[PDB]
Coordinates of C-alpha atoms and ligand atoms in Angstrom, one line a residue:
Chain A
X4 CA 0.0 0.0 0.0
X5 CA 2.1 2.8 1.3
X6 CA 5.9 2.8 1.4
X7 CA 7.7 4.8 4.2
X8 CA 11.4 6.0 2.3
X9 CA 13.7 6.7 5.3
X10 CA 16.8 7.9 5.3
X11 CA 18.0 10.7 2.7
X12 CA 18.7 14.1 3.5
X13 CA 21.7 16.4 2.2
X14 CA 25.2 15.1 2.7
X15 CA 28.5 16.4 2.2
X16 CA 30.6 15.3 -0.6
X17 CA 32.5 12.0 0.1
X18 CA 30.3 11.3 2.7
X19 CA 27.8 8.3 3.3
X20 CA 24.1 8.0 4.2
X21 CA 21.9 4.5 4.6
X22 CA 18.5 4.6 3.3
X23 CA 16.0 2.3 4.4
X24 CA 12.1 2.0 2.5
X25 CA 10.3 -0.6 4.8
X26 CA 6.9 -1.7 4.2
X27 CA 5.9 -2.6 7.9
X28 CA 1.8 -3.6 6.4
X29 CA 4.0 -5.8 5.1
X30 CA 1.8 -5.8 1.8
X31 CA 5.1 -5.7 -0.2
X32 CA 8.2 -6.8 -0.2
X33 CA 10.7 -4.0 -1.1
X34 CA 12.9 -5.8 -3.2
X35 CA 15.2 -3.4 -5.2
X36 CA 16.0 0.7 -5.5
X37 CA 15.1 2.6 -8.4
X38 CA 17.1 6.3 -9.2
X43 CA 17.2 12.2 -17.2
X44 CA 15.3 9.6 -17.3
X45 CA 14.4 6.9 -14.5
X46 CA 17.8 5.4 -13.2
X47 CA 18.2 1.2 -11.6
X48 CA 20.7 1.2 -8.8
X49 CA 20.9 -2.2 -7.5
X50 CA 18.3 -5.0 -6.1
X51 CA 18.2 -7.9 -3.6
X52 CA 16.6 -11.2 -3.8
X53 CA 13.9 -11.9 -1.5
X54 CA 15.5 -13.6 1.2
X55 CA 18.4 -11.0 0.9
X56 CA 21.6 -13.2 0.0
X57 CA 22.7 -12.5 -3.6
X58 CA 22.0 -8.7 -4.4
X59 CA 22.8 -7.8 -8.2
X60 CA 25.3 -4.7 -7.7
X61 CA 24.3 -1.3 -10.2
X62 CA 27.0 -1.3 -12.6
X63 CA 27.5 2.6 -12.6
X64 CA 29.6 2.8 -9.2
X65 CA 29.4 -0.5 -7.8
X66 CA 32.7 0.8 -6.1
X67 CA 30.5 2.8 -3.6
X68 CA 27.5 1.3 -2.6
X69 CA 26.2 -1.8 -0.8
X70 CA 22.6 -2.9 0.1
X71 CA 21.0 -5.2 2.1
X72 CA 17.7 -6.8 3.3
X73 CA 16.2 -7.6 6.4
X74 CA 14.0 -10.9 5.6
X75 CA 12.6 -10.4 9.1
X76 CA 11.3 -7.3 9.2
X77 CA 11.0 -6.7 5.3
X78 CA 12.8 -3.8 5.2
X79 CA 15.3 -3.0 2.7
X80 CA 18.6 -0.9 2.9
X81 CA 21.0 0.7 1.0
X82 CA 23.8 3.0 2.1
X83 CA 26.0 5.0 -0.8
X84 CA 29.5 5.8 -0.2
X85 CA 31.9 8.1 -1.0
X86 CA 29.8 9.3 -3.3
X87 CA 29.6 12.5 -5.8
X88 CA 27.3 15.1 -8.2
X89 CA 26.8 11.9 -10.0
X90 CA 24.7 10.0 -7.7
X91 CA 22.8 12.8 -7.0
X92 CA 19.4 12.2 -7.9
X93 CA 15.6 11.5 -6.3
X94 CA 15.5 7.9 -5.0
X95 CA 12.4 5.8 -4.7
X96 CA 12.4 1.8 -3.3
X97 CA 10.6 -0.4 -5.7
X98 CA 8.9 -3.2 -4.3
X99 CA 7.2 -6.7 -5.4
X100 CA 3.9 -8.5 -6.2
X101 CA 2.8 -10.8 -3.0
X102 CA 2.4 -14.1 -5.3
X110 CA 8.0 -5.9 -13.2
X111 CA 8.1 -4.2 -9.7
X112 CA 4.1 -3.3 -9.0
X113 CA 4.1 -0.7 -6.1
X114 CA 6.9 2.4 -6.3
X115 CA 7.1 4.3 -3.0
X116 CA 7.1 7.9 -3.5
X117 CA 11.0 8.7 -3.1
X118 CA 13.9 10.9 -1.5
X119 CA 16.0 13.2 -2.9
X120 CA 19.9 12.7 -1.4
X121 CA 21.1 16.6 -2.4
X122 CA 25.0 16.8 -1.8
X123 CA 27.2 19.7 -2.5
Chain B
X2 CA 42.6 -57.2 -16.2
X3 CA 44.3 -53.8 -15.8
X4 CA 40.6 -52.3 -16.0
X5 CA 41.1 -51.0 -12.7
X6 CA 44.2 -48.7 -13.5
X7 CA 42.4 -47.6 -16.0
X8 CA 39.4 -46.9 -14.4
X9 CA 40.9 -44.8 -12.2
X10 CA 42.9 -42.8 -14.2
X11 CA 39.9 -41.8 -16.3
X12 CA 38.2 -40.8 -13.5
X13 CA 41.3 -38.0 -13.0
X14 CA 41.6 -38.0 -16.6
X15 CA 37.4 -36.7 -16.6
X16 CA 37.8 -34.6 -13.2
X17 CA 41.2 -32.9 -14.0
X18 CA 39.6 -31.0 -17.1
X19 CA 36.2 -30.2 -16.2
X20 CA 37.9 -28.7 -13.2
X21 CA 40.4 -27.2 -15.4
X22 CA 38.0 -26.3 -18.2
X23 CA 35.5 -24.4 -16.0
X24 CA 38.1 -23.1 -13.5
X25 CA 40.4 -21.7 -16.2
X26 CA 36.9 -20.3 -18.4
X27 CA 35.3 -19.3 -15.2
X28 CA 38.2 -17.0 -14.2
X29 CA 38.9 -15.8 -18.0
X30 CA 34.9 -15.0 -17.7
X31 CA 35.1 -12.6 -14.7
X32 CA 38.1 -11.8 -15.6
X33 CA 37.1 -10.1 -18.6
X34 CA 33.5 -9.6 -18.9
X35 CA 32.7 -8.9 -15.3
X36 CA 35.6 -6.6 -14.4
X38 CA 33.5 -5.5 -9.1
X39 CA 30.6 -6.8 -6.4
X40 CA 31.7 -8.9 -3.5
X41 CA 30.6 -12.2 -5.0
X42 CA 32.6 -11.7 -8.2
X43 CA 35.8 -11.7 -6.0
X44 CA 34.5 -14.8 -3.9
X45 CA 33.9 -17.1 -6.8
X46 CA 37.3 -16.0 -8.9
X47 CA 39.4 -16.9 -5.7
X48 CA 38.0 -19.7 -5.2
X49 CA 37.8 -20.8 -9.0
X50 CA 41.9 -19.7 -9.0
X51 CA 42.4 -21.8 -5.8
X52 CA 40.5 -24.8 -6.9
X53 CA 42.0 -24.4 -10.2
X54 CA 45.3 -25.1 -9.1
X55 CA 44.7 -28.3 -7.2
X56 CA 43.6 -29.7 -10.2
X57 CA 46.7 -28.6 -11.4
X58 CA 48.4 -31.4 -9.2
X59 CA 46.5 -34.4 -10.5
X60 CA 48.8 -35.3 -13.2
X61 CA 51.5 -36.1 -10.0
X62 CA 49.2 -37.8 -8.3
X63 CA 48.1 -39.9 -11.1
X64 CA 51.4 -40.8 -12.0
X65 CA 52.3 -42.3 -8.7
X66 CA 49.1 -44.2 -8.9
X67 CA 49.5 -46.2 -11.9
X68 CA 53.5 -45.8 -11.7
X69 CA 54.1 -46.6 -8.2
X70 CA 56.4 -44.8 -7.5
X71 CA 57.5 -40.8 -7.8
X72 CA 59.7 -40.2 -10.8
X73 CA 59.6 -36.4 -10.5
X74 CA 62.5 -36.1 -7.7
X75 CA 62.5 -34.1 -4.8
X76 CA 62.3 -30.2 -5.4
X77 CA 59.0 -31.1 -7.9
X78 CA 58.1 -33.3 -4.6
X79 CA 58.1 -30.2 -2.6
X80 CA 55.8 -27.5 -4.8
X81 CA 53.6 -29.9 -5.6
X82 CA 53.0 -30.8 -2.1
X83 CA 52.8 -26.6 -1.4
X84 CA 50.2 -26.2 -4.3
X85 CA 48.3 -29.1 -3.3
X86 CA 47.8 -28.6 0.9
X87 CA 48.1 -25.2 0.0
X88 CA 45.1 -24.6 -2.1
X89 CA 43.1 -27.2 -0.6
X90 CA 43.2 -24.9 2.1
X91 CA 42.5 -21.8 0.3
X92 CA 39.8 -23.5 -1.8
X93 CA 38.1 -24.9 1.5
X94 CA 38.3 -21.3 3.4
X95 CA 36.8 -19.4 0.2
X96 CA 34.2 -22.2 0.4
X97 CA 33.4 -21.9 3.4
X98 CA 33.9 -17.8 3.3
X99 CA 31.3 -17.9 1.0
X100 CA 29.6 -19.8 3.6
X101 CA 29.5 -16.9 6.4
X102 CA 28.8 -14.3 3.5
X103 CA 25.8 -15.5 2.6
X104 CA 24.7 -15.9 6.4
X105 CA 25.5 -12.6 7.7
X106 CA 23.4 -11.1 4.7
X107 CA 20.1 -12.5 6.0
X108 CA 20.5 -12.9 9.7
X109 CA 22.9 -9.7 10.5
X110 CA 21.1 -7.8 7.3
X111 CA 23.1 -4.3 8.2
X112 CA 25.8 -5.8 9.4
X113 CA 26.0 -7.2 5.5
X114 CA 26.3 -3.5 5.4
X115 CA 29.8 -3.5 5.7
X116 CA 30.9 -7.5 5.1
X117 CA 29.4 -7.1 1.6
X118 CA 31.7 -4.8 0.7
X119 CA 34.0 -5.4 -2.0
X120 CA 37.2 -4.1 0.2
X121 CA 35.5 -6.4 3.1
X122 CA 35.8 -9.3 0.6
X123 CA 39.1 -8.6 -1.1
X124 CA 40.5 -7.7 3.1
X125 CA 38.9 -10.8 4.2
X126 CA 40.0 -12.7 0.7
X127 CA 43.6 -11.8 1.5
X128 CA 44.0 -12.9 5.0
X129 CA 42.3 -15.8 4.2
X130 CA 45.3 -16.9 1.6
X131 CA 47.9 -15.6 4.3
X132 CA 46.5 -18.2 7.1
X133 CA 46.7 -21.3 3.8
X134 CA 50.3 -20.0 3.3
X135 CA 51.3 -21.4 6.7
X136 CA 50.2 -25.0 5.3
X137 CA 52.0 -23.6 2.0
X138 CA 55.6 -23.2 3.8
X139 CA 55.3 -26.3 6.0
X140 CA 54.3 -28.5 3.0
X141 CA 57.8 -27.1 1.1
X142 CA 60.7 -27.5 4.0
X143 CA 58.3 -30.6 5.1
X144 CA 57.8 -32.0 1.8
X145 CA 60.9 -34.7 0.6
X146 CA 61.2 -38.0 -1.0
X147 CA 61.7 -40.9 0.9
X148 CA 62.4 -44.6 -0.3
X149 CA 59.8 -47.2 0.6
X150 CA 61.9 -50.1 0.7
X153 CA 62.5 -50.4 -4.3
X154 CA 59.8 -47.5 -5.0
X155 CA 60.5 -43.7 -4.0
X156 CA 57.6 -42.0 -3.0
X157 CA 56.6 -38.3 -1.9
X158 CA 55.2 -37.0 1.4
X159 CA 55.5 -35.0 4.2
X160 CA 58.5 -35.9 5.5
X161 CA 58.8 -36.6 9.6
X162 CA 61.3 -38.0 11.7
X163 CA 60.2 -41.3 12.8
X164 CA 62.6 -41.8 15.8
X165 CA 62.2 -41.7 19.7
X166 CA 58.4 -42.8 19.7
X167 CA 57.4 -40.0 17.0
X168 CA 54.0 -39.8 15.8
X169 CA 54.3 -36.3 14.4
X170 CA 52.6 -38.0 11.3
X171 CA 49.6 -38.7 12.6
X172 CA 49.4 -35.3 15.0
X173 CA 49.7 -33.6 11.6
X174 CA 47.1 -35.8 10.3
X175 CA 44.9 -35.2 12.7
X176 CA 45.9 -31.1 13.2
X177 CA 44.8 -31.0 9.2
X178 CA 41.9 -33.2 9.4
X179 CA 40.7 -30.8 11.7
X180 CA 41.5 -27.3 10.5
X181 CA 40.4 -28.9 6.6
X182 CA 37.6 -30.6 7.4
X183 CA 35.8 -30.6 10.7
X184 CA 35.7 -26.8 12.1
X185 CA 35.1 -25.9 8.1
X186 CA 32.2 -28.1 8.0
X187 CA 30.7 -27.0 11.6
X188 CA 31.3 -23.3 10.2
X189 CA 29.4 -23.7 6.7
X190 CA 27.1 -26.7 8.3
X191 CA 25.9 -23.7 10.7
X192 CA 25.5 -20.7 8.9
X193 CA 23.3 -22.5 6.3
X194 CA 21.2 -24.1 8.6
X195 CA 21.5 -20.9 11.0
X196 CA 20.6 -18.7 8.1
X197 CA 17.3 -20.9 7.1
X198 CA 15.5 -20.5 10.6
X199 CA 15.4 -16.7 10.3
X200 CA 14.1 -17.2 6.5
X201 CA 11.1 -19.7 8.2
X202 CA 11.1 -17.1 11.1
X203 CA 9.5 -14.3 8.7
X204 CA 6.0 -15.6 8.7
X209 CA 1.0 -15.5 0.0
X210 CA 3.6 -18.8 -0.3
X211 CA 7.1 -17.2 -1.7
X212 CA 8.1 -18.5 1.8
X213 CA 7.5 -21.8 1.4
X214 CA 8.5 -22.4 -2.1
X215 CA 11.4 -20.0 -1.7
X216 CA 12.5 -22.1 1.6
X217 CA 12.1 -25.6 -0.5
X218 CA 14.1 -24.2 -3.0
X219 CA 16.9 -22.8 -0.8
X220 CA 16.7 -26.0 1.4
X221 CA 17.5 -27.0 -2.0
X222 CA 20.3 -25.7 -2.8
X223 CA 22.0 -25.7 0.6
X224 CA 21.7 -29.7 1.2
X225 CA 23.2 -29.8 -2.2
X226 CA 26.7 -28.0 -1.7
X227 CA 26.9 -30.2 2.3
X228 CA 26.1 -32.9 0.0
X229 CA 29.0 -32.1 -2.2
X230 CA 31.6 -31.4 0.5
X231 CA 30.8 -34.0 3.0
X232 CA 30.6 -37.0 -0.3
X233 CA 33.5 -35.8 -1.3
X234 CA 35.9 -35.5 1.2
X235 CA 34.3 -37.1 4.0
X236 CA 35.6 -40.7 2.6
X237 CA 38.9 -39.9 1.8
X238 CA 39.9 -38.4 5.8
X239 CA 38.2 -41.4 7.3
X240 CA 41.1 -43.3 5.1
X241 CA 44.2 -41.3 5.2
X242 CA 43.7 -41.4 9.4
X243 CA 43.3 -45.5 9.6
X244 CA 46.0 -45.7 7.3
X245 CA 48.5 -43.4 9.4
X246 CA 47.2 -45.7 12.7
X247 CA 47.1 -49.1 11.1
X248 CA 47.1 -50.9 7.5
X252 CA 48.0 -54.0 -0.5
X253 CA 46.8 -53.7 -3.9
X254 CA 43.3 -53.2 -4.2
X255 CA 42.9 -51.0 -1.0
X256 CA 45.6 -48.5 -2.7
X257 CA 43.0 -48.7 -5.7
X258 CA 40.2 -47.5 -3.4
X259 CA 42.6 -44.9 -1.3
X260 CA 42.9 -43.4 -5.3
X261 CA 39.2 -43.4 -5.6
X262 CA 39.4 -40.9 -2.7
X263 CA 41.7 -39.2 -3.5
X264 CA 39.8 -38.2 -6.7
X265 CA 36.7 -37.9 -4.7
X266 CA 38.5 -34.9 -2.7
X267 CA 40.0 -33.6 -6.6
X268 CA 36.0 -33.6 -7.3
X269 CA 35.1 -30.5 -5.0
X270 CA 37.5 -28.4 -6.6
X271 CA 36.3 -29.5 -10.2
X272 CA 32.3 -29.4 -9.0
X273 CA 32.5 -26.6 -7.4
X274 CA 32.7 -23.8 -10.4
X275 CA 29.5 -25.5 -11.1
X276 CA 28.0 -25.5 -8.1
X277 CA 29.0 -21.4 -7.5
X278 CA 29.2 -20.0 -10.5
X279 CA 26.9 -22.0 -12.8
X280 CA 24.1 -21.7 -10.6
X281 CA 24.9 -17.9 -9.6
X282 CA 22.4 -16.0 -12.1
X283 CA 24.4 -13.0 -11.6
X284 CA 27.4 -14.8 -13.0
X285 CA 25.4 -17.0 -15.3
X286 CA 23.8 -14.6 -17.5
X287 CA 27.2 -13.1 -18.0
X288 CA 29.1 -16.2 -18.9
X289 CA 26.1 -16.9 -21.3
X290 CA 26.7 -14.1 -23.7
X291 CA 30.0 -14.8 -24.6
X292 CA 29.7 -18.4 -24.8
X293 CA 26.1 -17.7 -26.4
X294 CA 26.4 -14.5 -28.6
Chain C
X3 CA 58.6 -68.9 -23.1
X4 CA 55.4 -66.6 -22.1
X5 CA 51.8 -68.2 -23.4
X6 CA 53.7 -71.2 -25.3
X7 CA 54.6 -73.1 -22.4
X8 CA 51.3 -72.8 -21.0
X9 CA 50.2 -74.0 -24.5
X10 CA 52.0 -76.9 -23.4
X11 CA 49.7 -77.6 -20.7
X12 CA 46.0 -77.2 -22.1
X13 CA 47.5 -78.7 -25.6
X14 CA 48.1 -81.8 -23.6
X15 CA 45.1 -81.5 -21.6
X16 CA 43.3 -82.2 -25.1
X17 CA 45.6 -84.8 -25.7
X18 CA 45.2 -86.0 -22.4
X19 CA 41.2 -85.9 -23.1
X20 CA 41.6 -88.5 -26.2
X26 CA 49.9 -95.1 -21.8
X27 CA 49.0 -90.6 -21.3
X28 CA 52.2 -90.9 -19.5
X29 CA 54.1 -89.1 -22.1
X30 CA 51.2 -86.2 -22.3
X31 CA 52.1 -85.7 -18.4
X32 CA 55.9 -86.5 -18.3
X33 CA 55.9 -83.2 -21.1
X34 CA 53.0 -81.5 -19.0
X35 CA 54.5 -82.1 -15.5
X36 CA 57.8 -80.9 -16.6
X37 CA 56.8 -78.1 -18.3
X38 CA 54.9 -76.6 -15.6
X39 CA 58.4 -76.3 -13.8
X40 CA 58.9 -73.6 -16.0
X41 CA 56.4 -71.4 -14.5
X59 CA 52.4 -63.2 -5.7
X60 CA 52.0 -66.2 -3.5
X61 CA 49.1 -67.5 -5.3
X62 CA 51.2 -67.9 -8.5
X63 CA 53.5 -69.8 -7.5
X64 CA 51.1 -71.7 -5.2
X65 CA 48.8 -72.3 -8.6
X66 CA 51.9 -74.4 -9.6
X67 CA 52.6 -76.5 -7.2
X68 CA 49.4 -77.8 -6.7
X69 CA 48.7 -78.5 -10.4
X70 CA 52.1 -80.5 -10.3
X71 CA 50.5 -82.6 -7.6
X72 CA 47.8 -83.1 -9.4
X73 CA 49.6 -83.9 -12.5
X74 CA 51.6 -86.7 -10.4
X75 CA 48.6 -87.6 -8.9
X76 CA 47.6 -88.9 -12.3
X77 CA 51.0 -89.7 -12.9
X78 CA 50.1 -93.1 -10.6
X79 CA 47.0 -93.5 -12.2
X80 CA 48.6 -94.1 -15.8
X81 CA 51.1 -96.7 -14.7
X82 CA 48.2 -99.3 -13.5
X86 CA 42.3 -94.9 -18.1
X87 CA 41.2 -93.8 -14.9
X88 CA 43.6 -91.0 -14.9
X89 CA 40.9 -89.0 -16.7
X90 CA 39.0 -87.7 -13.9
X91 CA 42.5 -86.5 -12.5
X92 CA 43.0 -84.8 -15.4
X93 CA 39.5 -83.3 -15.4
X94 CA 40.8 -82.0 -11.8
X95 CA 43.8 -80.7 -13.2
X96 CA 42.2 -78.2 -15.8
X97 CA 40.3 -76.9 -12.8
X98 CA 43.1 -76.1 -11.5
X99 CA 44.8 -74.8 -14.3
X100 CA 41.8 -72.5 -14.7
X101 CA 42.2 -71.3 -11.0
X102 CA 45.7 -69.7 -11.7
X103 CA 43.9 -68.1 -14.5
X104 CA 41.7 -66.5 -12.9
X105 CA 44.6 -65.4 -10.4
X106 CA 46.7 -64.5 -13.9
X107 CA 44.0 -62.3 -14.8
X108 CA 44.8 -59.5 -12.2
X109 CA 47.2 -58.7 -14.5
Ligands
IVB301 C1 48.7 -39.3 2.5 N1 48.8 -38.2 1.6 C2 50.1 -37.9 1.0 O1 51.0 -38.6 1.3 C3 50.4 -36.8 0.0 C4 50.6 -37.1 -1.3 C5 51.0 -36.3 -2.5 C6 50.3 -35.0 -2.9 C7 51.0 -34.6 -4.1 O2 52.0 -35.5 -4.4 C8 52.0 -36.5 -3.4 C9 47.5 -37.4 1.3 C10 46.7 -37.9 0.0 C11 45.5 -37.0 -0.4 C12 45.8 -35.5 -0.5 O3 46.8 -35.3 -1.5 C13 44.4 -34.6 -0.7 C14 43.5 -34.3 0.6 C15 44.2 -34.4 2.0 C16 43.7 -34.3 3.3 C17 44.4 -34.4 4.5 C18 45.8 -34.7 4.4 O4 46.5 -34.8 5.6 C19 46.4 -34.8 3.1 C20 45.6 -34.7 2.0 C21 46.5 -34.9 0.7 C22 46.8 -33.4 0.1 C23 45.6 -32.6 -0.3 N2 44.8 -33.3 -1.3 C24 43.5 -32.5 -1.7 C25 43.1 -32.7 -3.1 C26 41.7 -32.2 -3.5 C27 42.0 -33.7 -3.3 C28 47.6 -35.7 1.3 O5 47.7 -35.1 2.6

């Protein structure tokens, strides 16, 4: 139903910050992050082992998921203007992601 | 009837390439196409690692069927260092892969950090370091001894004053190879399933049936094939022909098979990895 | 004298199957031509071949020689590791 995007906020450059879109109705599973046109920064399997890395700076970021509390996580690193962008979790039908929370914006400068 | 000679060394003549094969085009694959994410440097490691035990199957074969070691004493001594020593780095990447894929679901921020590619590479240098320990003893260790009539090549210990240093080192690798690795991977696995059935639609129970899946499979794998052949090499360093050093061969393969199974096991069944190696072998 | 002096033997044996005493005077000795049970696999086909060695000098030695390819066959078998 709804999607609560935690996390984001300005940052200084080189920093870091962990964003976390949960879906505590637990309705959907958020299974992968979504970033011109619409950019695809890495998703996660289901059960949160084998996560397929973005290819664009795969030397800065890392995600994870919590199975337990279906939550998913993602925390950027060392980043610059590049990544800047609006970011929005993408979650998954229950049994071509079907519900898109409605996003943050990570501003650095 | 020499079937059994030859039996035998078809079995390391069909293990030593597909090990070879896969291990070599594995790590040309990442090599080139996927340049890189933490399991990318997991799987190369261990495909380089396992790659070069099978490297030292044509020595072993040859004693086998040759009975004796025509190679000398300095070719005695790196192949006993590339053997133990990438056993043991082909064991701890296997069973590094093991922990990696447990933190992720039951420590998921924790993964955070592990998943890292630095965290990976960091842990995926030590991890070589603690295998070159066995890599330096197997080299001043490792000399040629006559049986008798017949040379042959081992780990070489003195044998006077009541010394049994040969079967302490037996059982000081049979436990740092074998039993703590298996405890290790045989708990995160079945650790890292009860928080997946702790989660409480049925993507849980076909997702759990399929992971239960694939988990009994690579046990299945390691404990099959090395589980028979460190039950033999202990009895025969406490007690005890012809056809029993037929069957110690068999094991010895069986232990050679991990290393050529496992590319299989982690790459060809890694979807990240498999679509990749598709496209160039599928353009 | 590899496969031709066991030749030798089963040669005779046929011979042996139609006084045999010269059959088994030129099969006794050349099994002194011939890894315990090979040389084992001799020495008891030699005992049966003088076994029937008695039996020519009073026809009857047949079923001694149907004994002794038996035997023959055994160290075969053990030949067959090989
Ligand atoms: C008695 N024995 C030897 O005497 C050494 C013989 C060699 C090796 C190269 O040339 C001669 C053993 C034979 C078998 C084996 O090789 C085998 C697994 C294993 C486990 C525990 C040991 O304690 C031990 C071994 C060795 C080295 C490592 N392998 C692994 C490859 C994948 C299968 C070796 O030691």
């Amino acid at each position: 139903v709804q999607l609560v995007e935690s996390g984001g906020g300005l940052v200084r450059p080189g920093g870091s910050l962990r964003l976390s879109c949960v879906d505590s109705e637990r309705t959907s599973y958020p299974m992968g992050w979504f970033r011109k046109e619409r950019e695809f920064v890495a998703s996660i399997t289901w059960s949160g082992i084998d996560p397929t890395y973005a290819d664009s700076v795969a030397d800065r970021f890392t995600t994870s998921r919590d199975v337990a509390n279906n939550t998913l996580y993602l925390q950027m690193n060392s980043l610059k203007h590049e990544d800047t962008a609006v970011y929005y979790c993408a979650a998954r039908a229950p049994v071509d992601y079907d519900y898109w929370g409605q996003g943050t914006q990570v501003t650095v400068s | 009837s020499p079937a059994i000679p030859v039996i035998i060394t078809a079995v390391y003549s069909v293990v030593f390439v597909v090990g070879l094969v896969g291990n070599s085009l594995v790590m040309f694959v990442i090599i080139r196409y996927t340049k890189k994410t933490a399991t990318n440097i997991y799987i190369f490691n261990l495909a380089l690692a396992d790659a070069l035990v099978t490297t030292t199957m044509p020595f072993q074969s040859t004693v086998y069927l040759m009975n004796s070691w025509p190679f000398g004493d300095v070719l005695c001594k790196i192949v006993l260092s590339i053997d133990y020593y990438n056993m043991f780095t082909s064991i701890f990447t296997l069973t590094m892969m093991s922990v990696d894929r447990y933190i992720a679901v039951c420590h998921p921020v924790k993964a955070l950090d592990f998943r890292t590619p630095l965290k990976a590479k960091i842990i995926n240098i030590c991890i070589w370091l603690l295998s070159s320990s066995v890599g330096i003893s197997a080299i001043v260790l490792g000399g040629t001894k006559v049986r008798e009539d017949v040379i042959e090549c081992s780990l070489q210990f003195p044998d006077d004053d009541y010394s049994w240093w040969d079967l302490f080192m037996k059982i000081c690798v049979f436990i740092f190879a074998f039993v703590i690795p298996v405890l290790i991977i045989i708990v995160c696995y079945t650790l890292m399933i009860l928080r997946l059935k702790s989660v409480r639609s049925r993507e849980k129970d076909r997702n759990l049936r399929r992971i239960t899946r694939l988990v009994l499979v690579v046990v299945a794998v390691f404990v099959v094939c090395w589980t028979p052949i460190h039950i033999f090499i202990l009895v025969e360093a406490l007690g005890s022909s012809t056809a029993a050093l037929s069957s110690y061969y068999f094991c010895i393969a069986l232990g050679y098979t991990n290393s050529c199974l496992n590319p299989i096991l982690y790459a060809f069944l890694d979807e990240n990895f498999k679509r990749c190696f598709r496209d160039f072998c599928f353009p | 004298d590899l496969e031709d002096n066991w030749e030798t033997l089963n040669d005779n044996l046929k011979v042996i199957e139609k006084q045999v005493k010269d059959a088994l005077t030129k099969m006794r000795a050349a099994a002194l031509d011939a890894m315990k049970d090979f040389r084992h696999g001799f020495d008891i086909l030699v005992g049966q071949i003088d076994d029937a060695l008695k039996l020519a000098n009073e026809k009857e030695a047949q079923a001694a020689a149907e004994q002794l390819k038996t035997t023959r066959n055994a160290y075969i078998q053990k030949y067959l590791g090989s």
